Assembly symmetry: C2
Homo-oligomer: 382 residues x 2
C-alpha cells in the first residue's frame, strides 16, 4: 500500500500548501478564515464549442466573495468531485454528486432539482476550511478563459500530493499523541459514524413510508368521505321536504372541504418531510465516506504497531520508527479536526431541519383545523 510511502517516505519534503491544525477549547480543529464565503449556483443556459444542437446545460457560479461569475457544465463539477476525492478523500469526507436521471434532461424537473443538489454540494465545499482554500477549488471558481481552465485542469490532475500523502502537508500545532490514544480516537469515530449511519438509514426509511402514505391512501380517504357526504346531500336535496336548502348546502360544502383537504394532504410532504429527507440523504452521503477513511487510519496504526519488530529485525532504523510515530500522530489530528467540523455542522443542520419540519407540520394541522372550522360555521344551529 501507498500508506507505507507516507509513513516511511525519504521525506525532507517541504510542502507548498500548508494546512494548519490547532487545539481550540474543545479538541483539535481546522483553521477557519475570518471571512466565510458561499457560492451561488444558478442561471442555467445552453452552451457550445463547435457541437451543434446537442447543447449542454451550463450553470453559472457566483461566489458571494468577489461576485465575479464563471460558467460550468455538469461534467465540470463531476471533474472537481473526483479531484477532491483523490486529493482529500483519505482525510475529509467528500459527499458524492447526484447521478443521471431520464433521457429528457433539458427542463425544470431535471436541471432544477439538479441545480438544487448541486447548490447544496457547492455550499458544503465553499464552507469547508480546507477544501475552499485549496488551489484546485480556488482556481475552479476564479479562471478567466479557456486558457486558465485548461492549465488549471492539468496541474490538478497531476498533483501527486493526494491519497494518504495529503497528511504530509498538515502541520498540527500541538504535542505528539501516543499510539494508545490514537487507536481509541479512531475506534470511537468508527463506532459513532456506523451507529449514526444506521440511525440515519432508519429515518430515511420511515420517511419514505410516510411519504408514500401521504400521497397515496391517506388523500383517497378524505376524498371518499367528501364524495360520500355529497352523494348523501344530493339525495337529501330531492326529498321534496321544505326548508332544507339550509342544511344540504352546508353538507355539500363540507364534502367539498374534505376534497380540498385530500389535496392539501397529498401536497404536504414537499413542504416539510422533503427537507428532513434531503438533510438525511446528504448525511448518508457523508457517512458513506468513513469506512474508507477509517480503513486508512486503521491500516496506518497497524503498520506502526510493527515498527518495533522492524527495528529489531533491522528492517528499518530507530529514526524511521519515530517518523512513523510522528506521522501517524498527524493523521490522528486531521481525523479529529474533521470530526470536529462534522459534529459542529451536524448539530446545526439537524437543529435547523427538525425545527423547520415541526414548524411546517404545525402550520399544516392548523390549516386543516381552519378549513374544518369554516365548513362548520356554515351549518345552521339546529
Amino acid at each position: 500500500p501507498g500508506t507505507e510511502q507516507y509513513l516511511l517516505a525519504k521525506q525532507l519534503a517541504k510542502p507548498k500548501e500548508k494546512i494548519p491544525i490547532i487545539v481550540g477549547d474543545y479538541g483539535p480543529m481546522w483553521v477557519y478564515p475570518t471571512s466565510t464565503f458561499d457560492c451561488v449556483v444558478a442561471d442555467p443556459r445552453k452552451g457550445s464549442k463547435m457541437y451543434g444542437l446537442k447543447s449542454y446545460i451550463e450553470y453559472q457560479l457566483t461566489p458571494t466573495n468577489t461576485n465575479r461569475s464563471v460558467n460550468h457544465r455538469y461534467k465540470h463539477f463531476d471533474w472537481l468531485y473526483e479531484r477532491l476525492l483523490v486529493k482529500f478523500g483519505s482525510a475529509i469526507p467528500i459527499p458524492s454528486l447526484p447521478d443521471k436521471q431520464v433521457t429528457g434532461r433539458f427542463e425544470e424537473e431535471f436541471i432544477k432539482m439538479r441545480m438544487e443538489r448541486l447548490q447544496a454540494w457547492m455550499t458544503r465545499m465553499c464552507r469547508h476550511p480546507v477544501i475552499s482554500e485549496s488551489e484546485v477549488f480556488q482556481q475552479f471558481l476564479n479562471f478567466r478563459d479557456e486558457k486558465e481552465w485548461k492549465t488549471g485542469k492539468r496541474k490538478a490532475e497531476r498533483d501527486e500530493l493526494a491519497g494518504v500523502m495529503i497528511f504530509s502537508t498538515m502541520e498540527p500545532e500541538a504535542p505528539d499523541l501516543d499510539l494508545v490514544e490514537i487507536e481509541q480516537k479512531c475506534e470511537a469515530v468508527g463506532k459513532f459514524t456506523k451507529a449514526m449511519d444506521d440511525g440515519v438509514k432508519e429515518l430515511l426509511t420511515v420517511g419514505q413510508e410516510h411519504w408514500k402514505r401521504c400521497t397515496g391512501p391517506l388523500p383517497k380517504e378524505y376524498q371518499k368521505i367528501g364524495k360520500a357526504l355529497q352523494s348523501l346531500a344530493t339525495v337529501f336535496s330531492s326529498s321534496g321536504y321544505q326548508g332544507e336548502t339550509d342544511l344540504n348546502d352546508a353538507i355539500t360544502e363540507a364534502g367539498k372541504t374534505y376534497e380540498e383537504i385530500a389535496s392539501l394532504v397529498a401536497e404536504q410532504p414537499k413542504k416539510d418531510l422533503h427537507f428532513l429527507m434531503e438533510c438525511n440523504h446528504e448525511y448518508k452521503g457523508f457517512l458513506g465516506c468513513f469506512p474508507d477513511i477509517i480503513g486508512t487510519h486503521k491500516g496506518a496504526i497497524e503498520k506502526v504497531k510493527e515498527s518495533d519488530k522492524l527495528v529489531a529485525t533491522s528492517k528499518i532504523t530507530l529514526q524511521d520508527k519515530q517518523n512513523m510515530v510522528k506521522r501517524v500522530s498527524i493523521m490522528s489530528y486531521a481525523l479529529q479536526a474533521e470530526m470536529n467540523h462534522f459534529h459542529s455542522n451536524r448539530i446545526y443542520d439537524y437543529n435547523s431541519v427538525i425545527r423547520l419540519y415541526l414548524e411546517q407540520q404545525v402550520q399544516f394541522y392548523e390549516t386543516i383545523a381552519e378549513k374544518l372550522r369554516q365548513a362548520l360555521s356554515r351549518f345552521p344551529v339546529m
Copy 2:
C-alpha cells in the same frame, strides 16, 4: 292477503283508539302532544324469579314525564319491539333492536353499549306521536306489579287491530285523495328511501375504512417516526462532542411527542366518527323497514286498480268500490304523515351529528398542532 280484508271489510267497526291526521302548513302530519316526554334507560342490576344465579340484567325505565320507575329485562324490550312491529309495522318504520354479542354478557363492554343503543331506541319511540300514545306502549311504562304486566301482556298479544288493519283506526281530517296522486306519492317515497339507503350505506362504508385506518396503520406511522427520532438522538448523545445536551433532549422529546400523537390518533374515532356511524346505522335500520311498507301500499293500490273490473263483473258493489277508494286514501295520508315525521327528524339528526363530528375533528387537529408547537418551543434557536 289480509290487505283485502281492510279494503273490503264489512266494516262499520267504530274504533277504540283513534289516530288523527291533519294537514298542517306543509303536508299531512301526525298530531303532536303539547308535552313531549322521553325515557331514561339506566341503572342495570341483577334480577330473579326462583332461578338461582343465571341472573339476568334488568334495566330501569324512568320517563321524564311522571318520573315513576319500572324495571325491564332485555327480553321485555324485544317483546315490545315485536308488538309494535305487528301493530304499527305496516305504517310506521320500527327500528330493530341490537342482537346477542359474546357469551360474557355480564359487564361494561356488553350491558353498557347495549344500554346505550336501547336508550336511543326508547327515545325514538317515546318521541313518536303515535307510538308513545298507544296502549301497549303506555302500559309498558306504567304498570305497578306482576299482575298488571301480565294482563297488559295479554290484551296486547291479542290486539287484532294490527297489520294493515291499523289504518282503520286512522281519521284523516282532509278531503279524499284520487288514485293518481296516491300512486305518485307512494312512488316518490319508494324512490327517496331507496336512494338514501344507498347514500347511507356508502357513508357507513368509507366510515369503517377510515376507522380501521385511524386505529391500525396511521398510528403506527407516527409511532415509527417517533422512535426513529429517538434512536437518532440517542446516537447523537454518544458523540462525545460538547454543548449538545441542548438539541438531543429536544429531539428525544419530539420523538416522544409523536408517540403521544400516535395514541391520540388511535383514540380519535370514538369521539367523532363513532357518532356519525351510529346515526347512519340507526337510519339504515329505519330505511330497512320501507321495502315492506311500500309493498303494502303498492299492493293496496293494485287492488283498487281492479275495483272497476270487479264492479263490472259484479264481484263487488259500487259502495264497496268507493270504500276501497276511501280507505286507500287514508293509507296515503298515514304514509305522508310518517314521511313528514321522518324528514323532520332526519334533518335535525344529520345537522346535529355532522356539526358534532366537525367540531370534534377541529378540536383534534388543533390539539395535534398544539402538541407539535410544544415540542418545537423546546428546540434551541440555532
